[PDB]
Amino acid sequence: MERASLIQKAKLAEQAERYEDMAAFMKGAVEKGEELSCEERNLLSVAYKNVVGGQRAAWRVLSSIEQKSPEVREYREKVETELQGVCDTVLGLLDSHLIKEAGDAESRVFYLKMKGDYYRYLAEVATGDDKKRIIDSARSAYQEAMDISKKEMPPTNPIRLGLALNFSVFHYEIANSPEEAISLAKTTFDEAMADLHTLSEDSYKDSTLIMQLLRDNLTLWT
């Protein structure tokens, strides 16, 4: 069908809270060849975030049941495999349709951050060596997004903050470096506050919510 309607069905999907359908529509809209607008971009991460979120939660529930004293493992693996399917789909979509397929610094950072997040999820369920490879491909994506944000965006831009937030989660929960996670989260927060004045009602609500998430993490981490 037409890109215009694909976009329309995703909005409907999100309304009816049918994220799997929503992610599929967006995927069809992406393969249409044309770049996505800011609005479209968010539809894409919201759809896939919800789909993958359910699987990640399922996985965590199961793996904990497995560790806490045959079926558990077999089922955890099924969920895990299904989760890796989605991540490879998102990553493929990014590598051959979205990443640097545009010009804007915001669109570029957004896509590279998304690449970091999905490699990060793949890292949550991987084991020895395969994990090291995945972890390193996650970091290079975050770092490249970080380099672009620090040169192209003010310290309060919500995308830059979302990126810095998730990159700190990466340091703490994946790269096993609590030290680095805490300082980046703290450094991102301060430089954010120090500019909050006249942050324009534009991205106010978003950056404000991410700033709170940064704090929650700092508290939980310390």
Binding site: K11, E14, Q15, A16, E17, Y19, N50
Partner: protein, 495 residues
């Protein structure tokens, strides 16, 4: 009260309790049903409250009331629901305990909710017959499917009202509608209660006001748990004083010093102590670590020691006095030589035995009777021998017999004194153990009663949450219904 008075002043951005109002509250000892009204300004709130006769104000109204009346003009549409952010914001203003989930406890202590809709413009017409205002409220709080930001915003305040308040009621508004609202309040609003079934009266409400307003003034969040504990500190301290007062009163009205025996005094102590502990138990609550009961125990022990000292002193005085009255005349007769004549030993021993008998027959000598007598008799031991060896009407063999008889009687007197001493120590030890067991007994009983009361409260919360879970499922919302099951599991870990 001839008329209303300001309870909490709001000046220059600061909320502060009115001392004059707190004073009035301290004088009202009867249980209170507290009804608070909130809503947009100029909506006829004060007018309606006379018929019955921002975020912090809203939160305080929730914390202090039995029934919370939210008043608005019009219908329950998007415009009206946007104003209910004040309810959603309660999760950021109120803390249930201090020891995204704390709000799961709100339904256990929040007031019943009543929505009064003024200048109502709908006929509520529906197929068959019209909706009642309560059905209209149910209709208005139904959720919308979807995960969009718009959907979440629509559902949030509705979910908060449905999940935070234990009961909901709606009234639309005219003279008869006001009459029906008042009748409902008068018949359904419950006495304000705190965790543990504690009924709030004037002094208790005064405490809550001070604690919550002080918290807000300190830049902290008002916490229900902290308020109950703060109240406990006050009432438990008073409970210890009341119990000690009761002990002193009972002991004073029943003790007669010196007591006939130590058992007499300890029996009275035990009985008075049991009554005192009961006074404390019924007047206290939330005595964490039993610190207050331990303080009471320490004070009763000191009181017991004082009575024992007074008792021993009263006995010593009485017995020493009797010694002077009974034996002094004999000592003087002996020193005067009344028994230094032929046959005087028999007369002396007979008199001495008669005097010892007299001493023993004197009433209520007390716990020092044997020690006082034996110490005296031993110190005057040489007197008997002096009279014996002097008497010539007694053969030497007879004197030898008497010396051995006197030695045996001295040993028996010593045994009476030694036993008196040992028995007293045993009785003191036994009383110590009995007192400890009495405290444990009443404490175990109170803790059992507290456990039952808490479980009862938790069962009510469980029932309310299961009810909502079912409504959500029946309504078709599994995502939210499943979230309820989560809160239910967490509640059950506490039971």
């Amino acid at each position: 009260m001839t008329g209303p008075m300001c309870l909490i002043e709001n000046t220059n951005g600061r909320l502060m309790a009115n001392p004059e109002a707190l004073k009035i509250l301290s004088a009202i000892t009867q249980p209170m049903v507290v009804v608070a009204i909130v809503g947009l300004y100029r909506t006829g709130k004060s007018y309606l409250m006379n018929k019955l006769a921002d975020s912090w104000i809203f939160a305080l109204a929730v914390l202090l009331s039995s029934t919370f009346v939210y008043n608005s003009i019009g219908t329950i549409n998007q415009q009206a629901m946007d104003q209910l952010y004040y309810v959603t914001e309660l999760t950021h203003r109120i803390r249930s305990k201090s020891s995204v989930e704390d709000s799961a406890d709100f339904v256990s202590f929040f007031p019943d909710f009543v929505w009064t809709l003024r200048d109502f413009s709908l006929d509520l017409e529906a197929d068959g017959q019209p909706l009642t205002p309560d059905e209209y409220l149910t209709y208005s709080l139904k959720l919308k499917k979807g995960t969009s930001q718009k959907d979440e915003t629509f559902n949030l305040p509705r979910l908060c009202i449905r999940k935070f308040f234990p009961k909901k009621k709606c009234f639309v508004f005219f003279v008869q509608q006001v009459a029906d609202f008042c009748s409902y309040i008068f018949s359904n609003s419950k006495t304000k209660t705190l965790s543990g079934g504690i009924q709030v009266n004037g002094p208790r409400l005064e405490s809550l006001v001070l604690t919550y307003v002080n918290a807000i003034s300190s830049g902290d969040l008002p916490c229900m748990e902290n308020a109950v504990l703060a109240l406990a500190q006050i009432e438990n301290s008073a409970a210890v004083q009341k119990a000690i007062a009761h002990y002193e009163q009972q002991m004073g009205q029943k003790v007669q010093l010196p007591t006939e025996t130590l058992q007499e005094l300890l029996d009275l102590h035990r009985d008075s102590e049991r009554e005192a502990i009961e006074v404390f138990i019924r007047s206290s609550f939330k005595d964490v670590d039993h610190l207050f009961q331990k303080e009471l125990a320490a004070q009763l022990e000191k009181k017991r020691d004082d009575f024992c000292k007074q008792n021993q002193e009263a006995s010593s005085d009485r017995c020493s006095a009797l010694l002077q009255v009974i034996f002094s005349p004999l000592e003087e007769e002996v020193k005067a030589g009344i028994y230094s004549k032929p046959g005087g030993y028999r007369l002396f021993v007979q008199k001495l035995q008669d005097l010892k008998k007299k001493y023993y027959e004197e009433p209520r000598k007390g716990i020092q009777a044997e020690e006082i007598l034996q110490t005296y008799l031993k110190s005057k031991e040489s007197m008997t021998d002096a009279i014996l060896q002097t008497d010539q009407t007694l053969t030497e063999k007879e004197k030898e017999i008497e010396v051995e008889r006197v030695k045996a009687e001295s040993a028996q007197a010593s045994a009476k004194m030694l036993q008196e001493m040992q028995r007293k120590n045993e009785q003191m030890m036994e009383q110590k153990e009995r007192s400890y067991q009495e405290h444990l007994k009443q404490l175990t009983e109170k803790m059992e009663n507290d456990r039952v009361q808490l479980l009862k409260e938790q069962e009510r919360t469980l029932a309310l949450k299961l009810q909502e879970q079912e409504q959500l499922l029946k309504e078709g919302f599994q995502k939210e219904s499943r979230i309820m099951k989560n809160e239910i599991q967490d509640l059950q870990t506490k039971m």
